[PDB]
A paper describes a structure:
We therefore set out to characterize two previously unstudied proteins from the shipworm symbiont [name] that were initially identified by the presence of carbohydrate binding domains appended to uncharacterized domains with probable redox functions. One of these was TERTU_3803, which contained both a CBM10 and a CBM2 domain attached to a range of distinct modules (via flexible linkers) that did not bare any sequence similarity with catalytic domains typically found within carbohydrate-active enzymes. Using a ‘module walking’ approach, we searched for other genes coding for these X-domains. This led to the identification of [name], which lacks CBMs but contains predicted X122, X183 and X132 domains. Taken together, these sequence analyses suggested that TERTU_3803 and [name] could have a role to play in cellulose metabolism, and furthermore that role is likely to be a redox one given the presence of cytochrome domains within their linear amino acid sequences.
Author numbering:
A (entry chain B): 1 to 80
B (entry chain C): 2 to 80
C (entry chain A): 2 to 81
The structure:
Amino acid sequence: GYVGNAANGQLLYANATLDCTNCHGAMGDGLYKIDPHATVFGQNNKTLENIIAEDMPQLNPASCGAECAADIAAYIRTWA
Amino acid sequence: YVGNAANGQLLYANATLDCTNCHGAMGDGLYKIDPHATVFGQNNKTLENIIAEDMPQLNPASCGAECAADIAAYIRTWA
Amino acid sequence: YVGNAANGQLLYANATLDCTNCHGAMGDGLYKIDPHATVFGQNNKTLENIIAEDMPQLNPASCGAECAADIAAYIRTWAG
Ligand code: HEC
Ligand code: HEC
Ligand code: HEC
Ligand SMILES: [Cl-]
Ligand SMILES: [Cl-]
Ligand code: NA
Ligand code: NA
Ligand code: NA
């Protein structure tokens, strides 16, 4: 399995093109909230990695796939 | 002088130098930085010298040779 | 209690505390922090005590004695 790299995720989350921070804030307390402790996300109870891979960023979800998502997820866990 | 990347990470994020506003957190902002390239600009400068001589644009003298080297050392990690 | 600079780095960058919004990543933001100084403000407080008692402005109590000591230990490293 891939194992997310939090250091990569720090930079990927802040990436100007992905633009996560514009919608979610620096640590998920912006316009749309992210709970960094939750293990299931959305109506389909996806993992953090899969919700990011499949659905984020909204502009173009395919621009952050599985490894990107795994890295970002590892970084998001540190928010708590 | 040999760049210190821990220093470089803070200097790149420095609020006065403000590199991130123009270049993003990892060089994918409005103006791109390619962390793989070894020559930069029309005069084929090193990463260190392009930063020292030309950046930030507001006042290039605010990040001189040592600052540039530390920031360059950090930017390579984006590869 | 002896501050843990590694943890200080994490706390300083935490968006709930939001120290970087006002002070910058290395104390060169809107409000400066001098990492060499040993007295701060008009009651000549220690670095730890100014943070514990007064920062962040949104809610001083969100960063107590331990938090302040860790962050202070990190701030000293900016001198390098
Ligand atoms: C322009 C809008 C927009 C952008 C850009 C965007 N998001 Fe979202 N995101 C949303 C909205 C809207 C939701 C659903 C509301 C919510 O739960 O926060 C959401 C939900 C999420 C959730 C589920 C949150 C929860 O607690 O249920 C995660 C995780 C998330 N986004 C991460 C990211 C990451 C990582 C990026 C980019 C790297 C990103 N988002 C980019 C708008 C955005
Ligand atoms: C307000 C604008 C602005 C600020 C601030 C700024 N730059 Fe730049 N930078 C540019 C522009 C414009 C170019 C040339 C176009 C390009 O290469 O993206 C450039 C070019 C560069 C290049 C060469 C990239 C290339 O491929 O040719 C590097 C490296 C760079 N800047 C680093 C920095 C660093 C390090 C800082 C601050 C610590 C900084 N810049 C601050 C606008 C800025
Ligand atoms: C939204 C504003 C704001 C936030 C958030 C904030 N500060 Fe401050 N801080 C100030 C202001 C204003 C001063 C006093 C004015 C000055 O020093 O110019 C100050 C003073 C300080 C001083 C004394 C510096 C001196 O010599 O004058 C330290 C140290 C400091 N803050 C650290 C922190 C730390 C650590 C955090 C959060 C973890 C924090 N601050 C959060 C606004 C902020
Ligand atoms: Cl970026
Ligand atoms: Cl700064
Ligand atoms: Na995605
Ligand atoms: Na310069
Ligand atoms: Na406090």
